[PDB]
Write an enzyme that holds these catalytic residues in place. Sequence first.
Site, PDB file in Angstrom:
ATOM      1  CB  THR F   1      -0.937   0.041   1.220  1.00 58.10           C
ATOM      2  OG1 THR F   1      -1.799  -1.103   1.207  1.00 58.10           O
ATOM      3  CG2 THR F   1      -1.777   1.305   1.201  1.00 58.10           C
ATOM      4  CG  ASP F  17      -1.220   2.581  -3.238  1.00 56.60           C
ATOM      5  OD1 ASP F  17      -1.912   2.628  -2.200  1.00 56.60           O
ATOM      6  OD2 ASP F  17      -0.227   1.830  -3.355  1.00 56.60           O
ATOM      7  NE  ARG F  19      -2.356  -3.878  -7.131  1.00 61.92           N
ATOM      8  CZ  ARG F  19      -1.545  -3.695  -8.165  1.00 61.92           C
ATOM      9  NH1 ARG F  19      -0.230  -3.654  -8.018  1.00 61.92           N
ATOM     10  NH2 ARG F  19      -2.067  -3.545  -9.379  1.00 61.92           N
ATOM     11  CE  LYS F  33      -4.311   0.241  -0.673  1.00 65.68           C
ATOM     12  NZ  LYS F  33      -5.350  -0.817  -0.585  1.00 65.68           N
ATOM     13  N   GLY F  47      -1.410  -1.262   4.806  1.00 68.49           N
ATOM     14  CA  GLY F  47      -1.277  -2.540   5.472  1.00 68.49           C
ATOM     15  C   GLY F  47      -2.545  -3.359   5.380  1.00 68.49           C
ATOM     16  CB  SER F 129       5.008  -1.186   0.427  1.00 67.80           C
ATOM     17  OG  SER F 129       3.890  -0.941  -0.406  1.00 67.80           O
ATOM     18  CG  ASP F 166       5.379  -0.317  -2.686  1.00 68.55           C
ATOM     19  OD1 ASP F 166       5.730  -1.491  -2.461  1.00 68.55           O
ATOM     20  OD2 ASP F 166       4.595   0.315  -1.949  1.00 68.55           O
ATOM     21  CB  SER F 169       1.927   0.314  -4.959  1.00 69.09           C
ATOM     22  OG  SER F 169       2.742   0.470  -3.810  1.00 69.09           O
TER      23      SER F 169
END
Lengths: 234, 202, 49, 226, 69, 221, 198, 242
Positions: F1, F17, F19, F33, F47, F129, F166, F169
Amino acid sequence: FDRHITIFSPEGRLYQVEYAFKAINQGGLTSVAVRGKDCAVIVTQKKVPDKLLDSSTVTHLFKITENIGCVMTGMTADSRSQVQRARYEAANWKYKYGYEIPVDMLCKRIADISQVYTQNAEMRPLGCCMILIGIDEEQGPQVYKCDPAGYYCGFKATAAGVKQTESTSFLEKKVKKKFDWTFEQTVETAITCLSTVLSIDFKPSEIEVGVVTVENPKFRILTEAEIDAHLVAL
Amino acid sequence: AAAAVVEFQRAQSLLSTDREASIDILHSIVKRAVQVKEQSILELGSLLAKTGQAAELGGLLKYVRPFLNSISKAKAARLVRSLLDLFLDMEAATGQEVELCLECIEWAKSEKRTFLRQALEARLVSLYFDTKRYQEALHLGSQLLRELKKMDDKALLVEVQLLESKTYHALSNLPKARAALTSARTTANAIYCPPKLQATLD
Amino acid sequence: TNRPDTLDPADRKIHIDLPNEQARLDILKIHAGPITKHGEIDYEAIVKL
Amino acid sequence: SLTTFSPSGKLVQIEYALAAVAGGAPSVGIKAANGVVLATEKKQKSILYDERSVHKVEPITKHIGLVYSGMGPDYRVLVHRARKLAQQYYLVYQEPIPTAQLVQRVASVMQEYTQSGGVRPFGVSLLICGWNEGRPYLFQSDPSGAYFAWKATAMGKNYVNGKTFLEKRYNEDLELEDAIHTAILTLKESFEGQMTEDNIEVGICNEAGFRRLTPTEVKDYLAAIA
Amino acid sequence: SKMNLSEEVDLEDYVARPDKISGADINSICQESGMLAVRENRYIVLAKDFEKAYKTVIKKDEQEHEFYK
Amino acid sequence: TTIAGVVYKDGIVLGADTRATEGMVVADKNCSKIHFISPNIYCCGAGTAADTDMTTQLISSNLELHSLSTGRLPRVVTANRMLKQMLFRYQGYIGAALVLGGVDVTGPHLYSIYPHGSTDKLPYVTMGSGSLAAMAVFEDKFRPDMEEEEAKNLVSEAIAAGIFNDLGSGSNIDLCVISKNKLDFLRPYTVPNKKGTRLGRYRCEKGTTAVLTEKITPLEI
Amino acid sequence: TTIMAVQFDGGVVLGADSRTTTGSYIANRVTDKLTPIHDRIFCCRSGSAADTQAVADAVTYQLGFHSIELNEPPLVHTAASLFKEMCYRYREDLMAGIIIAGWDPQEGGQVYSVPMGGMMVRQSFAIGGSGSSYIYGYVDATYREGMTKEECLQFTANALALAMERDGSSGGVIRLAAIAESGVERQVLLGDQIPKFA
Amino acid sequence: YDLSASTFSPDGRVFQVEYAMKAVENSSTAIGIRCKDGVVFGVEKLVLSKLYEEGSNKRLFNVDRHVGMAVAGLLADARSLADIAREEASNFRSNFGYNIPLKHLADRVAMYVHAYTLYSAVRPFGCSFMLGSYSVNDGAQLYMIDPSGVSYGYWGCAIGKARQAAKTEIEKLQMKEMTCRDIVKEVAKIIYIVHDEVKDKAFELELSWVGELTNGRHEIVPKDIREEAEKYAKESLKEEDE
């Protein structure tokens, strides 16, 4: 069956709550409060029987928090209990939200607690009326009087004690003319109102006067020096 | 907002000094924010009534009706009823009024206020009476009463009853007028003491 | 007498308050009218309470 | 303490609570086609009282409004617990509680607090309104934990004559504006003295969601319909 | 009318005030207003004296505690 | 994330982001998110998606209750104090890393809450991340008292660097601009990765696998 | 983390680095390790950021409540006692050391030391944080009785600059806070006012 | 009715606390005076039965090294409250590392009394008391507490049957600027003069103090000091008689 803490009479009439109001009135003193344009003031009788006591030891004003002052009218034990409960509530409020509790929330919390007392037929409605004075970001000199019955009502000017009614009428009269007061005007209004409703001249001793100002968000119990200064000046 | 307040204070000053310039200022502002326009309209109507220039009130109503509530305040009944009361109070009763109340009742189905529609129709009936037209007033007032029979007690109902009684005394002969008057007075026995309607009943 | 009196309005009802502000001091001076006490005559003591 | 059924099959304490509610601040509700209108006499006992602190009409959610007649403190506690219940409903069901469930649960709370010994049942009659679905709902909640759906109604000192007045006034064809007119007229006929704009509190509930009308709008409507 | 009023009487609004005053109360209002007028040696009664009489003869009723209601 | 927050001159700009990776798969491509904590407050999560979602919703509930009690807006200090207290009470089980941010009576505020609940008042913070690439971008091209358009552009650049350096992400970027007045919610603001643009159709003809048993029921209306 | 706190006549001066790492990800490069409690008292925290914040806030609440109750200024000894109680109780839970420094009427200018463990020892100066080791000897050597305000300030600056330079876990600016009758005065050496030694 | 703590009498007066003070109005006396550098306590310990012993049940006790108190009323409640204040003082010491201020101590014990007068399934305490303490950082402090739970800081006070006479003879003193040494003899004279031998037959005078002379530590008056004060009180009695 009205002997119970709170049990409706045939038409309602919670006689014990009304008796709590009579206990408040019989508290034995009187207090008045007003909010100025940007400064709020409060005065309260203060007696020293037997010539002992005196000092800060005997009083009825209490700094609930660094920015909120309060005054009591009622059975001293009950009033102090309320004061310390409200202190606990405000400290928890700061510890939870991170910001000083608004006077509205403080009075709301005490009002709900007193309502729970009335509600459950196990806790007596403790006989005292509380008044809070504070400054708000967008309301300036907030004044809120809360009662054991659970009202948390804010007055531009309020009074508690036996002469609550006459003081309220006088405040209505005075405010009807140009409520837009300054600090000196507000303090004069409060002191003169209390003097009129007591028909007593005041030495700086037998009274307690607290103030809050927008410039100085700090409840201040004015010392005898300033009390006498204002008294002699007007 | 601030500009509008500037021209409103200027309009007050020019009403004090020479009303023509203040009237022109108010008319310009009206031709010209929503609070600005509604104010401008209120003071324009006030000045027109004061100076007697009520002949333009009809045009004002006609061209404000398309956007009267559209601009804002579906409750613009404030202005609507203020204008109606001002005009009716103006007792000169000269010209105009032709197609005025007709288009106002039409209203393009925008207000749908039953109470305001009833009041407007009642004032139209009173105007027809004042215009020497009594059979039209009888017809429409009978319709209005048979429709809003329920409540309206005091005030508007008494006004309608008095219009009916006056029409009766005019053409339908005094017996019907007597009956209508008795009904009106009994129905008004518990009015809230409006002196205007009290005096009209007397 | 007290308030519970049938219905006698109109007249000129006056409230008489049991406590006294400083005419309590007055009243105690009048009742101290009896012979001077042979010295200090100040009532300050009873005055305070 | 409330179990003392009189020798008649009635519970005299709730009878007394209903009496006290009758002796309560007048309030009125009227459900229109596109929404509902709630109003109440907010007349303070002096100009001293800050007529912006103690509110009488409270939004329990962005689409649910609640007003009452009776005990102010009991009202505060009930509205708080209603906010609670509705909010847990939102959390579990990520959707506002429909008025039906909200009032069901509030009345259930009323009854459960009625059903013990150390408890004095509330002394407030509530007048919840909501716009869940494309339908406007009004519900009177009784101290006895009874919830009744309504078209229009009144509670407080003059509730019976308010009820008959609304009976004769209402017609299914009625827009929210005329509903406001009707409610304010009812409060006028049931009110003593002038309706100073800020002494009367009102809230509407529509597709826009429940909102308490400001002193400006209430002054406008009063000065118009007076 | 029998009383020596003044141009600052404002009776048309004094009556308009909402209240449960009775005829005896009106007579008491006038009498006590005159009594004040005399106290301060007025020659014609004033709106202030009528208002003071209004207070001293009417109202006085309370204990409708906001919780009590 | 990857979640980022930057306090520009007046308000706050948050960028997340999209995902959620329930393990080693892209469970969602447009994961929310960003969460509406209160009228003037949003929080970005990283997370454990479930943990962050539940925590954000619960705190939003409490804060909305408080705001309704007030008749006034809530405040980011209050929201942060809740978040830190509860994430401390939970000694670290929660896999929810928060970036809280709002604009209340006392201006804008932006705080970073780690899983244990540690709070560090910073004018700009990223977590997840890609938080490292995001910090890189902010340190490279941040100054005090930035303005709206370029603040949005730079937070977008930071999130894009996170996306591109990352794994796990988002495929798309969601942005939220909070001020004393506006609550812009661009969901998504931009899509660096649109889609692979599937080539020629490769469906099957009509009739592929005969059924064994059928229980067609005309459910009553 | 690196922090020092030194007392002088009539007041105290606290100093801290501006770093809070996790091996990497320096994160709060302007960390306000120094923190007020009620009016004058300040606490320096080292170790778990979360635990430190939690304990500091809890004791801040408690001390504020007690001070309001007493209507009297806080006692730094009272603050140190509260920290010691909490740390000794939740020794296993809490991974954090604290240092206290403030002023009070009775015994103005106090500095207590309750690092990881909850022990209480009042002392002239206290050293804490990851880099406390590299500078504990330097302070034990260079510290001389009788420092004044500015003397303590420069000694703190030098000591903390050395700690930050010799410790990777510490890095950033140097935040100093002087507490006395004048109140609390907080300043920061950013890049230049930081003493530089080779 | 006036039975339970719930019954707000129609006047607004809770009658059970009134009955508590009525019960308090049965113990002999307990007087105290806050000298400028300490606090001095005296009490009229009436030996009910001649078979009793000296060094026996006392109406004064020590809480912490730095606080003493004297009680008057139901001795059971007296001992209970004394032990109570004992553990509150101890817990404050545990929490904050230093002697509790008398102000806060009186606050907490007053709250405890207040709670036991509020609740319903309990009764208010049948005894009042007085808390004395001294410190260098805060001077000498004296407080009194009643069944209602009123904590007021007195420069000098008393409780019990002859509380009024105690107060009068207290105001017959420049309590502001005398020391414990002479104030002890004054308290002895107070007890002896207010004492009603005609009624009480047997009697004994019990005294104590806490002040700078004792380094802010509460202790009974030494044997010699108490004997001297008692002798002075007897001679003052003879003086007044003549």
